[PDB]
Write a protein that binds this ligand. Structure first.
Ligand SMILES: COc1ccc(-c2c(-c3ccnc(NC(C)=O)c3)[nH]c3cccnc23)nc1
Length: 304
């Protein structure tokens, strides 16, 4: 029989995904994360398995995929996905529990941008990698590793591009991600979903929101802000597309950038990156590769 799910023992319930239940399990003596889907969720399981098996996807800042498998308990079949386990869990959880140093903030922002740049990058060759857009980037979908760096997770809603024909591998539905992090063009449905670059640009808007969440938690001289989700000051919990659209598209508001972020170079660099991810016009936003370059130049300066 099989050598994956058969030999894994579930230990602790982690929580529920969009589809699938998440667990901490033990495989060959090591801790692993397991996501379990029912038979009726096969389409969601298969699509996530497909994204994680993309040629050349592996990267230090992308969740490490182990395997897709099935497990029959004698009554029903379970569809499994197995990955590396990260004890800190999400960046959302990490930022709620802790404050970070200037060094800590740059490590989190650089690692996030490096993972997104890798996802977004097309690699030519026999073992080429297609460009991939996430479509649901948020702090709850980024995990924090023991070394204080991030890895991008929740790849189930991703879209992949074929550069030669300029085609996207699936027929994309509108507004699939988390409403709070939807880019202006997604909220007002002006996004041209036939152009792959549109999805990459919408991911950068969401990454800007995540950088704002991190920067709030950066403590200098014991001074920092409390943890908040972006737009906590303007929309209810679980906002609708309409509530977000009125704020982001009509009133044209963005998360507030505090005055204290101008007192420190690292916070001035982060604040400038945010403003340049938040442009209503996606074509004006920075690329993930440009952000990675800016933050790498900053990490080198701070001696991280
Ligand atoms: C390809 O296989 C997987 C397996 C698990 C997850 C996954 C994880 C996950 C991963 C690693 N470590 C942890 N660690 C702590 C402490 O939660 C949690 N959290 C989630 C929440 C919702 C949906 N999926 C997930 N994704 C993909």
């Amino acid at each position: 029989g099989g050598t994956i799910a058969r030999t894994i023992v579930l230990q602790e319930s982690i929580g529920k995904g969009r589809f699938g239940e998440v667990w901490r399990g033990k495989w060959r003596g090591e801790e692993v994360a397991v996501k379990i889907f029912s038979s009726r969720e096969e389409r969601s399981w298969f699509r996530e398995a497909e994204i994680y098996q993309t040629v050349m996807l592996r990267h230090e800042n992308i969740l490490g995929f182990i395997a897709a498998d099935n497990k029959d308990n004698g009554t029903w079949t379970q569809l499994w996905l197995v990955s590396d386990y990260h004890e800190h869990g999400s960046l959302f959880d990490y930022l709620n529990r802790y404050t970070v140093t200037v060094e800590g903030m740059i490590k989190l922002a650089l690692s996030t941008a490096s993972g997104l740049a890798h996802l977004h990058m097309e690699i030519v060759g026999t073992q080429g990698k297609p460009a991939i857009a996430h479509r649901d980037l948020k702090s709850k979908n980024i995990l924090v590793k023991k070394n204080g760096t991030c890895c991008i997770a929740d790849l189930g809603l991703a879209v992949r591009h074929d550069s030669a024909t300029d085609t996207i591998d699936i027929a994309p539905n509108h507004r699939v991600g988390t409403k709070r992090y939807m880019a202006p063009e997604v909220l007002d449905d002006s996004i041209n979903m036939k152009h792959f670059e549109s999805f990459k640009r919408a991911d950068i808007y969401a990454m800007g929101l995540v950088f704002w969440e991190i920067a709030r938690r950066c403590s200098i001289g014991g001074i920092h802000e409390d943890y908040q989700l972006p737009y906590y000051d303007l929309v209810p919990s679980d906002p609708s597309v309409e509530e977000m659209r009125k704020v982001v598209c009509e009133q044209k508001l963005r998360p507030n950038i505090p005055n204290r972020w101008q007192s420190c170079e690292a916070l001035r660099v982060m604040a400038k990156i945010m403003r340049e991810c938040w442009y209503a016009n996606g074509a004006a936003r920075l690329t993930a590769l440009r952000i990675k370059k800016t933050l790498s130049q900053l990490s080198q300066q701070e001696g991280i």
